[PDB]
Amino acid sequence: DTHKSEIAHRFNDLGEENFQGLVLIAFSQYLQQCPFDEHVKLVKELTEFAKTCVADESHAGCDKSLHTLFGDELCKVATLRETYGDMADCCEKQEPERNECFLNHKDDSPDLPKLKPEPDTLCAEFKADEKKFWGKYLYEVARRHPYFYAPELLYYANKYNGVFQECCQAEDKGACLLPKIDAMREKVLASSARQRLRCASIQKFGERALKAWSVARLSQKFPKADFTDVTKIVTDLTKVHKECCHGDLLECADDRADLAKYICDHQDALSSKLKECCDKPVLEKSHCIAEVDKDAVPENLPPLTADFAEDKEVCKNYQEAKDVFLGSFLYEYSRRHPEYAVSVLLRLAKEYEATLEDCCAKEDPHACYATVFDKLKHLVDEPQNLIKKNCELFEKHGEYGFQNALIVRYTRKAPQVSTPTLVEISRSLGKVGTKCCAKPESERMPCTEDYLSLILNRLCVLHEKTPVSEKVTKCCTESLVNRRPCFSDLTLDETYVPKPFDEKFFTFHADICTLPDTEKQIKKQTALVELLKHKPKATDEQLKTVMENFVAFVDKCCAADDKEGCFVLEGPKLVASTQAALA
Ligand SMILES: C[C@H](CO)OC[C@@H](C)OC[C@H](C)OC[C@@H](C)O
Ligand SMILES: C[C@H](CO)OC[C@@H](C)OC[C@H](C)OC[C@@H](C)O
Ligand SMILES: O=C(O)c1cc(I)cc(I)c1O
Ligand SMILES: O=C(O)c1cc(I)cc(I)c1O
């Protein structure tokens, strides 16, 4: 009854500003092609109704579920069908089915214009109206990333306000702002991929997959906490992530604030690093908790072999509650090994399971399971080796060269994937060298497997919507935890039928000359993928010969008196020499 006024309750708990920011984010993520001006109106209508409900909770409609009021507002958008086609059909449904329907139409690759920073323009807008400026920011990010973790987005608006406040008083605005925006953009993209993975886990592997992942991660972060404190927190946190992934953004933010306050209330049982966070206002406090460094491993923890290999009762304990016993193995192993990746720790738990399945049926189980850590070694040696060979390859060739070697690998592994996605994924995979090869020894495996999971999840999300490789389907869907090693093991897809040589990718207009460097590399990388789709067994020398010819040709025509003339009239030679080189 009273708290049937969910909207008043959210408005009271979050305050007007956050309430509006979250409602704006929600409309932007479901209706990614509506203009800001439209969404601002819908936000203001809901905020007014919220204020009415707050003054009187018995006003008509104040008892509806917030997520029902929100859906209803979606359904009352006049251009809903015009713009979102089928999406309109979702309106014929009852909740929760309606929402699930809408969520199905979130577009992970909306291919919205690139937002290129005009420092003076940004600053004029920021000076004119700070609130509108931040609103437009939330809307641009949220419509491009319809799974962006909403409370963090509110945070990135707040944190970066100082940016604009400082920068926009400077005479040289561009020199001040541009580095900061690049940094902002980097934070955003990583935050987006991370949340997109959490929402994919929950949807494709279920809530329990995200819980296991979080047990391992939180046991590393707060290794002094009790198992049951970690599971309480992971459960609350996974609820918050679920609510955010399902578009329940105000309940999401409200739950996260309670979680943040719970963690600060119990900081002494969790981690001494939390002291930093616990006197901050709520968005910042939450952000700081999500980013806290791993606490030190306490002293005097028994060796893992005591409960899990040496003990005579392993089988009985396992048999009485497998899930608890294995959750507990995962907690005990994670808290002791901050230098292992979460996904490696989950692999270790899975193999430990398979071992006791095998061992607990035998005549003498103890003799078999006592040596289990020897059997697990390989799951630690394989990632370290992956890092060692790829980092050496990265440092031998640098980022661009490492990207190209990954283009060659991935195009062979999944040559049916569209060329822009293979390029996009391969360039990100190459950047995992830039982000992780130089890290401390104990951060390298966590850094590498985490970024790999984010980027492979991105390939899985794109592929799930237009499946074209059965091997990608298998590695995306068979096991979240083994995704990375499943992709790692793929070899040249032997069922693939090469395409004819696609010349357009080796033919250009004069405006290639003025492309930003990044775009120029993407041009060469596109060409490289297309070489491999045509001749997947091309040799390193043939690939090198073709690309060198390519760059030499582009240089030559960009030097010409008549650039378009040289590209058009000489262009057939590059095409011919490229084909000659692949013989
Ligand atoms: C209605 C309004 C746009 O006019 O909505 C957006 C607004 C509430 O932005 C919230 C955002 C978190 O505030 C940023 C800080 C720096 O004030
Ligand atoms: C599910 C996982 C493979 O993803 O491996 C099994 C194991 C790690 O389960 C952990 C899970 C969080 O159990 C915790 C229960 C006891 O509270
Ligand atoms: O994902 C988060 O936002 C997050 C938020 C809180 I509060 C605490 C933890 I640990 C988190 O990891
Ligand atoms: O932050 C998480 O909770 C998280 C969850 C999953 I599933 C995968 C990665 I990499 C993560 O960082």
Side-chain angles (χ1 to χ4, degrees):
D1 311 69
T2 284
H3 267 203
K4 221 301 208 52
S5 196
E6 179 173 26
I7 191 171
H9 180 49
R10 298 306 182 210
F11 184 93
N12 290 323
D13 285 348
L14 297 160
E16 194 160 327
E17 175 173 83
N18 286 339
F19 179 94
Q20 294 191 315
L22 291 161
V23 171
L24 172 58
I25 290 164
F27 278 117
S28 312
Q29 293 187 327
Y30 281 80
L31 292 180
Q32 296 165 79
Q33 301 186 36
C34 288
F36 180 71
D37 197 45
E38 273 298 318
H39 285 162
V40 170
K41 293 170 177 145
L42 296 177
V43 172
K44 273 185 194 159
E45 257 177 53
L46 270 179
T47 303
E48 290 322 283
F49 179 70
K51 286 171 185 192
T52 295
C53 295
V54 163
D56 176 30
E57 301 197 12
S58 82
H59 186 274
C62 295
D63 60 312
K64 288 187 259 192
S65 285
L66 183 47
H67 213 69
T68 301
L69 293 166
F70 178 87
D72 291 350
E73 287 297 307
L74 289 186
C75 289
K76 299 192 284 136
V77 173
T79 59
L80 184 70
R81 195 176 309 273
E82 191 84 328
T83 304
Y84 301 90
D86 287 347
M87 199 181 161
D89 297 346
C90 298
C91 299
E92 301 171 56
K93 293 152 193 289
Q94 289 176 168
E95 295 286 19
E97 276 72 25
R98 190 171 61 171
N99 184 51
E100 300 177 20
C101 188
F102 287 128
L103 290 172
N104 276 305
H105 296 65
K106 286 173 154 179
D107 187 358
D108 284 297
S109 161
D111 308 311
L112 294 172
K114 270 297 292 186
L115 272 180
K116 37 87 145 43
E118 249 287 338
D120 289 330
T121 300
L122 288 170
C123 280
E125 286 305 310
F126 176 75
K127 263 104 148 270
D129 187 349
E130 257 169 67
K131 203 201 168 169
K132 180 194 185 301
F133 181 82
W134 285 122
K136 179 79 203 293
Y137 174 82
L138 298 187
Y139 153 91
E140 293 298 358
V141 174
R143 71 196 194 101
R144 287 176 170 74
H145 301 274
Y147 295 89
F148 203 94
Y149 190 26
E152 277 298 301
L153 188 48
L154 293 190
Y155 169 77
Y156 289 124
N158 279 268
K159 172 207 206 151
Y160 290 127
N161 189 60
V163 161
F164 275 81
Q165 224 138 237
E166 252 190 35
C167 289
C168 299
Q169 285 167 313
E171 270 299 340
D172 202 334
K173 323 262 206 283
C176 182
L177 273 171
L178 287 203
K180 272 128 129 132
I181 282 168
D182 289 311
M184 210 172 322
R185 175 186 157 86
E186 199 96 27
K187 257 224 147 273
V188 153
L189 296 174
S191 170
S192 186
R194 195 174 313 112
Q195 187 62 14
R196 185 66 192 85
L197 171 62
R198 289 186 185 115
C199 303
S201 306
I202 286 161
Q203 161 199 356
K204 298 293 151 162
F205 296 92
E207 220 186 337
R208 68 210 169 281
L210 180 59
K211 290 175 178 182
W213 199 280
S214 300
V215 168
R217 205 257 304 197
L218 251 66
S219 301
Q220 298 183 311
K221 226 84 163 322
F222 301 157
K224 89 189 225 229
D226 285 344
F227 179 42
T228 218
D229 293 338
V230 166
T231 62
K232 195 263 194 262
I233 293 164
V234 165
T235 302
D236 291 0
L237 174 67
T238 288
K239 253 77 199 156
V240 170
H241 282 134
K242 185 173 81 200
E243 286 168 356
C244 261
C245 296
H246 295 172
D248 302 326
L249 306 184
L250 300 159
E251 181 172 12
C252 175
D254 212 2
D255 292 340
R256 191 182 190 223
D258 294 340
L259 181 62
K261 164 164 210 281
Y262 178 89
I263 293 169
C264 286
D265 292 336
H266 294 106
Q267 70 193 279
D268 288 344
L270 294 170
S271 166
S272 73
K273 310 270 149 99
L274 289 170
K275 266 165 191 88
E276 206 180 35
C277 310
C278 293
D279 51 9
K280 298 167 190 258
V282 51
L283 295 177
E284 184 184 353
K285 174 148 57 74
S286 296
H287 173 78
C288 172
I289 296 162
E291 302 285 53
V292 68
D293 294 310
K294 289 167 189 181
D295 200 15
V297 173
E299 298 188 77
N300 292 100
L301 293 183
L304 275 178
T305 45
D307 285 340
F308 296 116
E310 193 275 318
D311 190 313
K312 288 133 137 27
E313 304 274 64
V314 165
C315 290
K316 179 230 271 265
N317 297 337
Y318 177 56
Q319 271 142 18
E320 290 303 275
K322 292 181 180 196
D323 285 335
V324 177
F325 190 72
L326 284 173
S328 167
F329 178 80
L330 178 56
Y331 153 86
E332 298 284 12
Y333 219 134
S334 302
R335 64 203 295 232
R336 284 168 180 72
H337 287 284
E339 74 288 0
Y340 295 173
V342 171
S343 60
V344 165
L345 283 158
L346 289 164
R347 288 178 222 132
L348 284 166
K350 270 159 58 89
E351 184 91 55
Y352 180 72
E353 185 187 30
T355 301
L356 298 189
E357 283 309 298
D358 179 32
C359 297
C360 295
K362 297 185 190 309
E363 292 86 327
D364 179 41
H366 197 16
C368 171
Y369 73 69
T371 69
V372 69
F373 290 87
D374 192 82
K375 305 180 204 154
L376 296 174
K377 226 177 86 44
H378 80 283
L379 296 166
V380 177
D381 293 348
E382 184 274 333
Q384 282 166 352
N385 246 88
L386 180 89
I387 291 162
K388 226 79 217 85
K389 318 248 85 211
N390 290 282
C391 289
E392 174 174 356
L393 185 69
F394 166 73
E395 50 216 29
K396 167 192 210 184
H397 295 302
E399 193 181 88
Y400 171 72
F402 187 50
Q403 287 168 339
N404 293 342
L406 290 170
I407 272 146
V408 172
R409 274 195 223 166
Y410 277 78
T411 307
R412 286 174 167 156
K413 289 170 188 274
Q416 305 81 357
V417 169
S418 71
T419 294
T421 298
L422 283 166
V423 173
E424 179 206 336
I425 291 301
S426 300
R427 284 168 67 78
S428 298
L429 290 174
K431 291 204 60 56
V432 177
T434 304
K435 278 320 156 312
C436 308
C437 292
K439 282 195 185 315
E441 176 126 78
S442 70
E443 291 179 30
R444 234 150 61 137
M445 196 195 311
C447 184
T448 293
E449 296 269 15
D450 292 349
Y451 281 104
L452 292 177
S453 294
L454 303 186
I455 295 153
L456 295 168
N457 184 59
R458 172 59 170 183
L459 176 59
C460 295
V461 164
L462 293 181
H463 192 251
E464 199 266 342
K465 78 168 139 171
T466 311
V468 288
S469 162
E470 319 210 357
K471 284 159 182 225
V472 172
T473 292
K474 193 232 190 57
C475 288
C476 293
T477 62
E478 134 232 289
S479 156
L480 186 49
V481 142
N482 288 309
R483 218 108 109 150
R484 195 287 292 158
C486 179
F487 279 106
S488 275
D489 286 347
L490 292 180
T491 55
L492 168 76
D493 181 348
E494 291 280 25
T495 62
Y496 173 63
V497 176
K499 64 183 281 188
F501 181 68
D502 201 330
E503 324 90 69
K504 58 176 195 282
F505 296 108
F506 292 81
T507 293
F508 323 89
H509 297 289
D511 72 340
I512 194 176
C513 302
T514 54
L515 281 190
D517 274 14
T518 297
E519 251 59 62
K520 269 194 246 266
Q521 297 170 355
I522 281 161
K523 294 262 160 208
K524 295 182 272 163
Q525 290 172 323
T526 295
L528 180 54
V529 171
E530 291 282 345
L531 286 173
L532 285 144
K533 279 179 169 182
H534 170 51
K535 280 303 164 192
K537 280 166 213 216
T539 63
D540 296 342
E541 179 265 339
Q542 300 171 302
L543 295 171
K544 204 172 317 311
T545 300
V546 175
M547 295 313 290
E548 286 175 335
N549 286 345
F550 183 110
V551 167
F553 178 88
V554 166
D555 283 344
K556 148 156 76 76
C557 288
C558 294
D561 282 321
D562 174 354
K563 283 174 219 285
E564 181 73 6
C566 169
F567 280 107
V568 167
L569 298 173
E570 301 296 322
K573 282 205 253 278
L574 179 54
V575 169
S577 89
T578 298
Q579 293 183 277
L582 302 167

